[PDB]
Short mmCIF file of C-alpha atoms and ligand atoms in Angstrom, two decimals:
data_model
loop_
_atom_site.label_atom_id
_atom_site.label_comp_id
_atom_site.label_asym_id
_atom_site.label_seq_id
_atom_site.Cartn_x
_atom_site.Cartn_y
_atom_site.Cartn_z
CA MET A 1 -44.85 44.96 126.01
CA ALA A 2 -45.32 43.11 129.32
CA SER A 3 -44.66 39.53 129.96
CA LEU A 4 -47.61 36.83 130.57
CA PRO A 5 -49.54 37.60 133.53
CA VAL A 6 -49.83 34.26 135.20
CA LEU A 7 -51.19 32.40 138.16
CA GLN A 8 -48.15 32.59 140.19
CA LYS A 9 -44.27 33.88 140.09
CA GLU A 10 -42.11 33.60 142.81
CA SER A 11 -38.48 32.63 143.28
CA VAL A 12 -37.88 29.46 144.92
CA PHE A 13 -33.79 29.26 145.08
CA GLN A 14 -31.73 32.37 145.34
CA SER A 15 -27.70 32.65 145.41
CA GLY A 16 -26.55 33.03 148.76
CA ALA A 17 -24.12 30.91 150.57
CA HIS A 18 -24.24 28.74 147.17
CA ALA A 19 -25.00 29.50 143.77
CA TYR A 20 -28.44 27.57 142.18
CA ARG A 21 -28.75 26.38 138.62
CA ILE A 22 -30.22 23.62 136.84
CA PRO A 23 -33.74 23.40 137.72
CA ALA A 24 -35.86 20.17 137.65
CA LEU A 25 -39.54 19.95 138.62
CA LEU A 26 -41.61 17.06 139.32
CA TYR A 27 -45.36 16.96 139.90
CA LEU A 28 -46.81 14.33 142.30
CA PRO A 29 -50.80 14.18 141.23
CA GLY A 30 -51.66 11.89 144.38
CA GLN A 31 -50.30 14.54 146.77
CA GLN A 32 -50.88 17.74 144.28
CA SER A 33 -47.35 18.51 145.32
CA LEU A 34 -44.19 19.65 143.37
CA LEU A 35 -40.65 18.76 143.93
CA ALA A 36 -38.21 21.06 142.80
CA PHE A 37 -34.87 20.31 142.51
CA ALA A 38 -31.80 22.36 141.49
CA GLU A 39 -27.53 22.19 141.69
CA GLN A 40 -26.43 23.81 144.51
CA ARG A 41 -22.94 24.89 143.35
CA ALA A 42 -19.99 26.80 145.19
CA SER A 43 -20.11 29.31 142.38
CA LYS A 44 -21.94 29.83 139.09
CA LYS A 45 -19.22 27.77 137.07
CA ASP A 46 -20.43 24.05 135.99
CA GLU A 47 -17.18 22.74 137.75
CA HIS A 48 -18.07 24.14 141.08
CA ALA A 49 -21.41 21.93 141.16
CA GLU A 50 -21.57 20.19 144.39
CA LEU A 51 -24.58 19.02 145.99
CA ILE A 52 -28.40 18.63 145.07
CA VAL A 53 -31.30 20.40 147.18
CA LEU A 54 -35.06 20.11 147.16
CA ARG A 55 -38.16 21.99 148.19
CA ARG A 56 -41.61 20.12 148.07
CA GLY A 57 -44.59 22.77 147.72
CA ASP A 58 -47.99 22.02 148.00
CA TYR A 59 -50.66 23.25 145.56
CA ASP A 60 -53.55 24.67 147.81
CA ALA A 61 -56.87 24.53 145.91
CA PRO A 62 -58.76 27.33 147.73
CA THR A 63 -56.22 29.79 146.87
CA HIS A 64 -55.00 28.08 143.67
CA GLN A 65 -51.34 28.72 144.70
CA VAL A 66 -48.15 26.69 145.71
CA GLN A 67 -46.67 27.00 149.56
CA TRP A 68 -42.98 25.51 149.55
CA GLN A 69 -41.77 23.77 152.69
CA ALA A 70 -37.93 24.77 153.63
CA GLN A 71 -35.49 23.54 151.19
CA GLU A 72 -32.81 20.76 152.28
CA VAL A 73 -29.74 19.01 150.98
CA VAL A 74 -30.90 15.54 149.76
CA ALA A 75 -27.78 14.16 151.84
CA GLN A 76 -28.07 10.74 149.90
CA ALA A 77 -27.79 11.83 146.74
CA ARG A 78 -23.62 12.07 146.34
CA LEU A 79 -20.86 9.83 145.54
CA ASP A 80 -17.98 9.65 147.76
CA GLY A 81 -15.35 12.37 146.24
CA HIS A 82 -17.55 13.47 143.60
CA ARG A 83 -19.76 16.45 142.77
CA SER A 84 -23.29 15.82 141.86
CA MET A 85 -25.02 17.47 138.64
CA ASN A 86 -27.79 17.30 136.32
CA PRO A 87 -30.91 16.32 138.71
CA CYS A 88 -33.30 14.32 136.80
CA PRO A 89 -36.49 13.37 138.80
CA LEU A 90 -39.12 10.78 137.88
CA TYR A 91 -41.92 9.16 140.01
CA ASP A 92 -42.97 5.66 139.30
CA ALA A 93 -46.90 6.01 139.89
CA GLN A 94 -47.10 2.09 140.05
CA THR A 95 -44.42 1.24 143.11
CA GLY A 96 -45.00 4.73 144.53
CA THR A 97 -40.86 4.79 144.02
CA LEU A 98 -39.54 8.42 143.64
CA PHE A 99 -36.43 8.20 141.18
CA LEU A 100 -33.56 11.33 141.21
CA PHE A 101 -30.99 10.48 138.72
CA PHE A 102 -28.02 12.44 138.12
CA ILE A 103 -23.93 12.46 137.29
CA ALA A 104 -20.97 12.34 139.58
CA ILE A 105 -17.99 13.65 138.38
CA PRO A 106 -14.57 13.31 140.15
CA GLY A 107 -13.95 16.38 142.16
CA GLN A 108 -13.69 19.52 139.54
CA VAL A 109 -12.43 17.89 136.42
CA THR A 110 -14.35 19.34 133.68
CA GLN A 111 -16.34 18.28 130.61
CA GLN A 112 -13.58 20.02 128.41
CA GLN A 113 -10.77 18.28 129.82
CA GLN A 114 -12.46 15.04 129.16
CA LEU A 115 -13.45 16.08 125.20
CA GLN A 116 -9.82 17.33 124.90
CA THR A 117 -8.32 14.12 125.84
CA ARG A 118 -11.24 11.72 124.63
CA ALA A 119 -11.42 10.36 128.05
CA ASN A 120 -14.48 9.74 130.10
CA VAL A 121 -14.75 10.00 133.91
CA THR A 122 -18.54 10.54 134.26
CA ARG A 123 -20.81 8.26 136.49
CA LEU A 124 -24.46 8.01 136.27
CA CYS A 125 -26.08 7.25 139.39
CA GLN A 126 -29.38 7.26 141.72
CA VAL A 127 -31.27 7.29 144.86
CA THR A 128 -34.87 6.35 145.68
CA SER A 129 -37.50 7.46 148.32
CA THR A 130 -40.66 5.52 149.29
CA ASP A 131 -41.96 8.74 151.54
CA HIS A 132 -42.03 11.28 149.01
CA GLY A 133 -38.84 13.09 149.63
CA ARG A 134 -38.84 12.60 153.24
CA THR A 135 -35.74 9.95 153.43
CA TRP A 136 -33.80 8.69 150.71
CA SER A 137 -32.00 5.41 150.17
CA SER A 138 -27.98 5.15 149.78
CA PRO A 139 -27.03 5.97 146.39
CA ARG A 140 -26.44 3.87 143.41
CA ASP A 141 -23.75 4.16 140.59
CA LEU A 142 -25.41 2.72 137.34
CA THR A 143 -22.51 3.28 135.24
CA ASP A 144 -21.27 -0.46 134.66
CA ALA A 145 -25.19 -1.65 133.99
CA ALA A 146 -26.34 1.21 132.20
CA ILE A 147 -23.03 2.12 129.75
CA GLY A 148 -20.50 -0.72 129.93
CA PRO A 149 -18.98 -1.44 126.71
CA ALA A 150 -20.29 2.23 125.17
CA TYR A 151 -18.41 3.92 128.07
CA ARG A 152 -14.76 3.79 126.14
CA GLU A 153 -16.71 5.09 122.78
CA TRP A 154 -17.62 8.51 124.71
CA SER A 155 -15.61 11.30 125.42
CA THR A 156 -18.09 12.18 128.19
CA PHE A 157 -22.02 12.49 128.53
CA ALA A 158 -25.02 13.80 130.62
CA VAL A 159 -28.62 13.20 131.67
CA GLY A 160 -31.50 15.74 131.26
CA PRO A 161 -31.28 17.95 133.09
CA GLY A 162 -34.81 18.07 134.03
CA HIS A 163 -37.79 15.57 134.39
CA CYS A 164 -37.72 12.28 132.93
CA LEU A 165 -40.60 10.22 131.51
CA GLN A 166 -42.61 7.26 131.97
CA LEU A 167 -44.43 5.95 129.42
CA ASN A 168 -47.71 4.33 128.79
CA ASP A 169 -46.51 1.23 127.76
CA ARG A 170 -47.72 -2.05 129.50
CA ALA A 171 -44.51 -1.86 131.44
CA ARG A 172 -44.74 1.71 132.14
CA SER A 173 -41.27 2.16 131.16
CA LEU A 174 -38.87 4.63 132.32
CA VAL A 175 -36.89 6.92 129.72
CA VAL A 176 -34.25 9.26 130.65
CA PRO A 177 -33.08 11.50 128.16
CA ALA A 178 -29.05 12.21 127.39
CA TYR A 179 -26.37 12.88 125.28
CA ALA A 180 -22.88 11.76 124.55
CA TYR A 181 -19.78 12.93 122.53
CA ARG A 182 -18.96 10.05 119.99
CA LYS A 183 -15.24 9.35 118.87
CA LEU A 184 -15.94 8.79 115.23
CA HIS A 185 -13.14 10.04 113.36
CA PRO A 186 -9.58 9.47 114.44
CA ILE A 187 -8.49 13.27 113.13
CA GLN A 188 -11.70 15.20 113.24
CA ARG A 189 -12.93 15.81 116.73
CA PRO A 190 -15.92 13.93 118.46
CA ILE A 191 -19.45 15.03 117.71
CA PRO A 192 -22.08 14.77 120.49
CA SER A 193 -25.36 13.13 119.60
CA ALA A 194 -28.87 12.71 121.51
CA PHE A 195 -30.28 9.45 122.69
CA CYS A 196 -32.15 7.78 125.93
CA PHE A 197 -31.54 5.64 128.76
CA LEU A 198 -34.50 2.67 128.95
CA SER A 199 -35.92 0.74 131.58
CA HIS A 200 -38.50 -1.79 131.55
CA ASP A 201 -38.71 -2.73 134.85
CA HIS A 202 -39.08 -0.06 137.17
CA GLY A 203 -35.67 0.81 137.54
CA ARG A 204 -33.77 -2.63 137.91
CA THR A 205 -32.08 -2.88 134.89
CA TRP A 206 -31.03 -0.24 131.96
CA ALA A 207 -30.27 0.00 128.15
CA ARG A 208 -29.18 2.77 125.98
CA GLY A 209 -31.32 3.53 122.86
CA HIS A 210 -29.99 4.58 119.45
CA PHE A 211 -28.21 8.22 118.37
CA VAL A 212 -29.87 11.14 116.46
CA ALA A 213 -28.17 11.27 113.47
CA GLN A 214 -27.04 14.75 114.27
CA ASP A 215 -24.66 17.10 116.01
CA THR A 216 -27.06 17.11 119.22
CA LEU A 217 -26.46 18.22 122.80
CA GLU A 218 -28.91 18.31 125.76
CA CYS A 219 -32.70 17.01 125.27
CA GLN A 220 -35.95 16.11 126.67
CA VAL A 221 -38.74 13.58 125.29
CA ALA A 222 -42.36 13.76 125.82
CA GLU A 223 -44.89 11.04 124.78
CA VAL A 224 -47.70 12.17 122.34
CA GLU A 225 -50.60 9.72 121.26
CA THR A 226 -51.47 10.11 117.54
CA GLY A 227 -54.77 8.82 115.93
CA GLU A 228 -52.90 5.44 115.43
CA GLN A 229 -50.11 5.45 117.96
CA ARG A 230 -47.88 6.69 120.67
CA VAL A 231 -44.83 8.39 119.73
CA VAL A 232 -41.87 9.90 121.64
CA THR A 233 -40.69 13.68 120.28
CA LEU A 234 -36.97 14.55 121.20
CA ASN A 235 -36.33 18.08 121.15
CA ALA A 236 -32.85 19.01 121.03
CA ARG A 237 -30.44 21.50 121.74
CA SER A 238 -27.82 22.35 118.43
CA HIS A 239 -25.41 24.61 117.35
CA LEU A 240 -26.52 25.32 113.99
CA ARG A 241 -29.10 28.39 115.07
CA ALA A 242 -32.24 26.10 115.01
CA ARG A 243 -33.49 23.12 117.35
CA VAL A 244 -33.21 19.45 115.98
CA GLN A 245 -36.06 17.91 116.52
CA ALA A 246 -36.42 13.80 115.86
CA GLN A 247 -39.28 11.15 116.43
CA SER A 248 -39.29 7.68 117.78
CA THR A 249 -41.78 5.22 116.65
CA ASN A 250 -40.14 2.51 119.11
CA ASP A 251 -40.43 4.27 122.44
CA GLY A 252 -36.90 5.85 122.54
CA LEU A 253 -35.06 3.05 120.56
CA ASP A 254 -34.76 4.57 117.33
CA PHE A 255 -35.27 8.41 116.36
CA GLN A 256 -35.96 9.35 112.81
CA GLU A 257 -36.61 12.20 110.79
CA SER A 258 -33.87 14.16 112.05
CA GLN A 259 -34.07 18.08 110.93
CA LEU A 260 -33.23 21.44 111.84
CA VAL A 261 -36.80 23.84 113.08
CA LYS A 262 -36.07 26.88 111.99
CA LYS A 263 -38.54 27.99 113.88
CA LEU A 264 -37.42 27.50 117.58
CA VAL A 265 -34.51 29.35 117.29
CA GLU A 266 -31.00 28.80 118.68
CA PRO A 267 -28.45 31.23 120.05
CA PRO A 268 -24.81 31.03 119.32
CA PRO A 269 -22.22 29.67 119.73
CA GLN A 270 -23.47 25.92 120.78
CA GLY A 271 -27.29 26.96 121.85
CA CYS A 272 -29.34 26.47 125.13
CA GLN A 273 -31.04 23.60 127.00
CA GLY A 274 -34.77 24.03 126.48
CA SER A 275 -37.89 22.13 128.08
CA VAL A 276 -40.89 19.75 126.43
CA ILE A 277 -43.76 18.47 127.66
CA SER A 278 -47.27 16.90 126.39
CA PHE A 279 -50.66 17.91 127.52
CA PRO A 280 -54.07 17.19 126.96
CA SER A 281 -55.41 18.70 124.17
CA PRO A 282 -58.32 20.90 124.99
CA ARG A 283 -60.14 19.56 122.06
CA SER A 284 -57.97 15.83 116.57
CA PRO A 285 -54.59 14.83 118.45
CA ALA A 286 -55.06 13.70 122.09
CA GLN A 287 -52.08 15.91 123.28
CA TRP A 288 -50.64 19.32 122.49
CA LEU A 289 -46.81 20.25 123.11
CA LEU A 290 -45.57 22.89 124.97
CA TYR A 291 -41.89 24.14 125.01
CA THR A 292 -40.14 26.75 126.74
CA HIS A 293 -36.58 28.18 125.66
CA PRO A 294 -34.87 31.88 124.98
CA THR A 295 -36.30 33.35 121.88
CA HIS A 296 -33.20 35.49 121.25
CA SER A 297 -30.81 35.12 117.79
CA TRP A 298 -27.75 36.18 119.68
CA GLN A 299 -27.96 35.64 123.68
CA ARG A 300 -30.06 33.48 126.24
CA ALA A 301 -32.79 35.80 127.11
CA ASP A 302 -36.53 36.02 126.93
CA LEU A 303 -38.24 32.67 127.95
CA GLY A 304 -40.75 31.75 125.43
CA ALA A 305 -43.62 29.47 125.16
CA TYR A 306 -44.09 27.63 122.31
CA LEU A 307 -47.09 25.48 121.18
CA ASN A 308 -47.58 22.81 118.83
CA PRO A 309 -51.26 21.96 118.25
CA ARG A 310 -50.41 19.39 115.32
CA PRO A 311 -47.34 17.50 116.99
CA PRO A 312 -44.78 16.43 115.93
CA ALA A 313 -44.83 18.63 112.84
CA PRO A 314 -42.01 20.82 112.68
CA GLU A 315 -43.73 23.58 110.90
CA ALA A 316 -46.72 23.47 113.14
CA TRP A 317 -44.83 25.17 115.86
CA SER A 318 -46.54 28.41 116.86
CA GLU A 319 -44.47 32.26 117.31
CA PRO A 320 -43.59 32.12 120.84
CA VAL A 321 -45.31 34.01 123.58
CA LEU A 322 -43.24 35.92 126.26
CA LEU A 323 -43.18 34.30 129.60
CA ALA A 324 -40.14 36.26 131.06
CA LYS A 325 -38.32 39.41 130.18
CA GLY A 326 -34.41 39.51 130.07
CA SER A 327 -31.65 36.80 130.87
CA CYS A 328 -33.65 33.62 130.79
CA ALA A 329 -31.36 30.03 130.19
CA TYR A 330 -32.37 26.84 131.39
CA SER A 331 -36.02 25.56 132.05
CA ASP A 332 -38.48 22.55 132.89
CA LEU A 333 -41.79 22.19 132.41
CA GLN A 334 -44.77 19.96 134.15
CA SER A 335 -48.38 19.57 133.31
CA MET A 336 -50.10 20.08 136.65
CA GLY A 337 -53.66 18.73 135.64
CA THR A 338 -56.71 20.79 135.47
CA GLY A 339 -56.02 24.66 136.41
CA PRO A 340 -58.73 27.26 138.27
CA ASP A 341 -60.12 28.37 135.03
CA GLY A 342 -60.82 24.84 133.58
CA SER A 343 -57.83 24.79 131.42
CA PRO A 344 -54.44 22.68 131.47
CA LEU A 345 -52.25 23.99 134.29
CA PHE A 346 -48.81 24.35 134.08
CA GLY A 347 -45.35 24.47 136.36
CA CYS A 348 -42.25 26.19 135.29
CA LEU A 349 -39.17 26.37 136.75
CA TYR A 350 -36.12 28.54 134.94
CA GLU A 351 -32.84 30.01 135.36
CA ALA A 352 -33.13 33.98 135.33
CA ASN A 353 -30.80 37.09 135.93
CA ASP A 354 -27.44 35.83 134.94
CA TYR A 355 -28.11 32.39 136.96
CA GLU A 356 -28.62 34.11 140.47
CA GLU A 357 -32.34 32.40 141.01
CA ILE A 358 -34.65 30.19 139.73
CA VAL A 359 -38.12 31.07 139.53
CA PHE A 360 -41.59 29.24 139.49
CA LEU A 361 -44.05 29.96 137.34
CA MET A 362 -47.48 28.65 137.33
CA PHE A 363 -49.85 29.15 134.65
CA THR A 364 -53.00 27.75 132.24
CA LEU A 365 -53.36 27.25 128.65
CA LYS A 366 -56.16 30.03 128.42
CA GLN A 367 -53.51 32.36 129.95
CA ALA A 368 -51.12 31.55 127.42
CA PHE A 369 -52.55 31.12 124.19
CA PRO A 370 -56.21 32.64 124.72
CA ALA A 371 -56.49 32.84 120.91
CA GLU A 372 -57.24 28.66 121.60
CA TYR A 373 -60.76 30.05 123.30
C1 DAN B 1 -22.22 18.35 132.14
C2 DAN B 1 -22.20 19.83 132.14
O1 DAN B 1 -21.11 20.65 132.61
N1 DAN B 1 -23.30 20.06 131.70
C3 DAN B 1 -23.44 21.73 131.11
C4 DAN B 1 -23.89 22.11 129.45
C5 DAN B 1 -22.76 21.32 128.28
O2 DAN B 1 -21.79 21.90 128.71
C6 DAN B 1 -23.30 21.24 127.14
O3 DAN B 1 -24.33 20.62 127.10
C7 DAN B 1 -22.31 20.82 126.35
O4 DAN B 1 -21.59 19.72 126.53
O5 DAN B 1 -23.99 23.21 129.55
C8 DAN B 1 -24.29 24.36 130.10
C9 DAN B 1 -24.77 25.33 129.85
O6 DAN B 1 -25.20 26.47 130.43
O7 DAN B 1 -24.46 25.90 128.17
C10 DAN B 1 -24.17 24.16 131.72
C11 DAN B 1 -24.22 22.72 131.84
O8 DAN B 1 -23.94 22.38 133.53
#
């Protein structure tokens, strides 16, 4: 009946003078440290978002616990006159550059407004750091160079939220998951579709991948090595009572085999954000997928961990394991290497209790799916 016993469970953000939503977790392997980001908002409402805050947590091997340093605002992560949303972190292991992608929206202009008027005013931005978050560069607006001509074709858009992906292709490409509302019919209202932004030069230039032929929203991507190639699995939010899963054989440019995965429930009326990561298989496939998302048929509750030992086969998704009882919403996963018990170690940030705190969970595969051992 109880939720899963884990290595650590600590609230790293709490409502106070500000509210905190939309978690993003990024693991730094060389430091054995985590960077937890979140939207520091004036209230729980989406349009009250303001700045992005951060906390550095250092894993202590002797105690197998993470001690977090004090939170601080990423002062540089903002455009004058705009509120910052959707933190999407990414570390470039080759350049030693830490990236924080996010969107900036004028004052409190809502998503609803952009949708009803078919008028886009959202900006795509970023900030970088060479000392693991100690200091940040000035912000940079990537809208023109990354969206350009397509801007007028979308009512609005967003990235992530959550960790991004750096591929294992020769260029070590940066992949930023996203979605946009497409103006397709003169009368019918624009339909949203997932897609990815792509950079093959360590963040110098960007491009837009193609859309998932389905009414899809927020998504995340993970890279899996099959017996023949590297594939990018995309897991997206949907309003059809089930998640939509698609696959790409060309590093994010095209997604196919789009379909509903009835085993992964989505609550009404439009679903909820979820997270997906790949990690070293304990054993044919080299990597397995772990996914976290609410498991309730009618509301956002009971965060579950799902395992796919035969990725990306839709019917291979396991039944969920209960990670947290009650109100649970957005989440973000990170693989942290080998844990204290020899099995894959995981870090997970998730919204809990009617959006009043963001909890950090650390557990292993042995703890979550013991039947595997
Ligand atoms: C940019 C933005 O407002 N994102 C919001 C997102 C969005 O409304 C949905 O993906 C449909 O577009 O939904 C939710 C949500 O808890 O359901 C919170 C996000 O802050």
